Design a protein around this ligand. Structure first.
Ligand code: GDP
Ligand code: GDP
Ligand code: CO
Ligand code: CO
Lengths: 359, 369
């Protein structure tokens, strides 16, 4: 693959944010990431697909588009009764596997075997009040991340299951790889770029207020399509809903944007954190969920920044003016401390929905 | 790549039509066509991109998605003055080249250097009243075909320049390769599938059933703008003018090879057979909306090609008139026009033609090709 070379970037403490780079040529002042080395990295990357009540036909297209090389991790939070959509998804995955021999793990977010595993290792931020896994995208992602960690993945890439364009999914995974192949830190994040303009406006404002120089470096504030090395992923606290993506940025800037407590994450401060932003060649066509979603998305997004400890009054004032105070985003602790072998054994010993195919 | 295996098909004389097959898995009762094999074949296939006044960003996306290995042939019939859109396209292509070094050839359909070469070799089917190359997509493809032959391509694949999905284009090229890798004959065609299409197919299938007595639905790629052929097949096909080209390829193949007749003339074609693959892409087809008239015209030309076929019957012709008139695009007592058909280019001595083009074309630009 050919891409614009990573030239311009902005540094905030230990955080390097690379300017957005366009994919120049798909199949191969320009960076040349040979097809050969991309495929080589693919085998070390788990593609996590969090889904919830999506049309099977879209799900089918997405799964078929993921490079065979990549282990697929599906976390469903689909409706369980009247009708059991989880069952329909299971039938779909079984058929898909019978025709492709894809390496796949799937599990339902509400499996009581999952709740049991988290309680026993003493990680309870993911549990709701009835002691079951809380409903939500961030929760499903966390579950997916632990499963990816349990199979030894070095990189994890997330892709939404409601994409109308299978080929874009195929490109996303390759672009994540390209991004990882262009970085020099083991702590790397790759975010894809095609309200989000509102979100980016404020994220940049979050840093501007301190530097005194207006910036537009961040253009992936709401990027659902992103990937990270497992080393970075395991140390990040995670929020949920529409706050996940922007919270990753806010948290990284908050914690590593200055040299405070370097002692606690000495290796991260040493290597630094790299954030690549890649503009895909394919446009973005997904399901239209109605606007009580769009409104939600912006409320949660700006709330994440509004509550950041980096937010000055000016910033807070403006966010309010632009939008009662915004609810504080629910944040869950990093999963690093979790003894993975132990967690995994409890999961596979008590989960009634966990399905594995060559993995 | 994984596709459903080519299990079912229907044979008409020396013509084999494979039942449509779906792509099952992108990168790798199921046929496994490994990536490495597809990549080896791409070097031998030229991708022809006929374009006329399309948006530059769309054109850009299409060229960036064609596998680097494939030589690219562009034939533009874009506006020449007020403003010179061909120049905007040349700037675009020059920039694309400096960033990727893709092998490319581009020329403008109306280049007087082209008309000179056709005229000089005695091929006038393509020239209009004043001896200039006729406007029309079929005519642009014919030009692209000779260029592809001139540079030694074994296969040719067509791709429309107004695709909103670069990825779909990347898939099309690989699907063509898949089809050729699954074929056995040197005379092979690969057509991609994803109301006009449905209507055209309804009648092409009818064209056949009027003779077999059994209703079929085997043909599902009647209006397949995205298709490929081995050069060996491409060079023996007459090509219809303007937008009537794709359905006519099916019609002519049925009329001429649908029965064992006058075999000596196409000796080897009858020996090897003609194979047509139909592959349903994983990607959706999303291209530019050109409006109602355009859609009516595609309809009119598609059915006209079938209405005038030698295989057509009275029942079929009447069913077509009712449909066209009833659909309001054919006057109440008017029949479909008979699209002009240009002859096969096999007899054109390509060296001779290519020399004339090279020595007289003002729009011809080559990049490592
Ligand atoms: N596992 C899991 N997945 C979810 C949940 N909610 C949404 N998803 C999926 O995560 C992705 C979210 O994208 P979408 O809901 O379309 O949000 P948008 O595209 O930002 O408006 C889709 O694949 C959803 O099906 C959830 O509660 N649990
Ligand atoms: N070279 C050439 N290309 C053409 C001509 N007319 C159309 N094209 C191109 O061939 C493809 C035709 O697509 P379109 O006209 O949109 O037909 P559709 O896909 O059936 O709606 C596009 O790339 C057009 O830009 C022509 O006269 N000459
Ligand atoms: Co969505
Ligand atoms: Co079109």
């Amino acid at each position: 693959m050919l891409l614009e070379a990573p030239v311009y970037k902005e540094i905030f403490g230990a955080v390097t944010i690379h300017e957005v780079q366009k994919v120049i040529k798909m199949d191969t002042t320009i960076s040349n990431i040979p097809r050969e080395k991309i495929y080589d990295l693919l085998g070390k990357m788990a593609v996590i697909v969090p889904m919830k009540n999506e049309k099977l036909h879209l799900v089918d297209g997405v799964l078929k588009a993921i490079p065979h090389k990549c282990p697929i991790i599906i976390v469903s939070n689909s409706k369980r009764e009247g009708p059991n959509r989880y069952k329909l998804e299971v039938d779909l995955i079984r058929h898909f596997y019978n025709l492709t021999h894809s390496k796949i793990i799937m599990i339902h977010q509400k499996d009581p075997g999952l709740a049991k595993a988290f309680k026993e290792v003493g990680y309870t931020d993911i549990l709701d009040e009835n002691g079951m896994i809380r409903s939500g995208k961030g929760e499903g992602m966390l579950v997916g991340l632990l499963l990816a960690k349990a199979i030894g993945a070095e990189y994890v890439g997330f892709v939404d299951a409601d994409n109308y364009i299978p080929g874009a999914v195929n490109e996303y995974v390759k672009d994540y790889a390209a991004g990882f192949l262009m970085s020099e830190s083991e702590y790397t994040m790759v975010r894809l770029h095609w309200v989000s303009e509102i979100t980016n406006h404020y994220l940049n404002l979050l840093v501007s207020e301190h530097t005194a120089f207006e910036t537009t470096i961040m253009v992936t504030g709401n990027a659902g399509e992103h990937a990270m090395t497992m080393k970075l992923a395991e140390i990040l606290p995670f929020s949920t809903g529409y706050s996940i993506e922007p919270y990753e940025i806010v948290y990284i800037l908050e914690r590593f944007g200055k040299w405070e407590n370097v002692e606690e994450f000495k290796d991260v401060f040493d290597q630094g954190i790299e954030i690549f932003q890649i503009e895909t060649l394919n446009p973005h066509f997904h399901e239209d969920k109605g606007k009580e979603h769009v409104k939600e998305m912006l409320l949660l997004s700006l709330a994440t920044i509004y509550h950041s400890k980096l937010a000055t009054d000016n910033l807070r004032k403006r966010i309010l003016k632009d939008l009662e105070e915004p609810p504080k985003p629910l944040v869950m602790r990093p999963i690093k401390e979790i003894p993975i072998k132990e967690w995994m054994d409890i999961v596979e010993g008590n989960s009634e929905t966990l399905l594995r195919f060559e993995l």
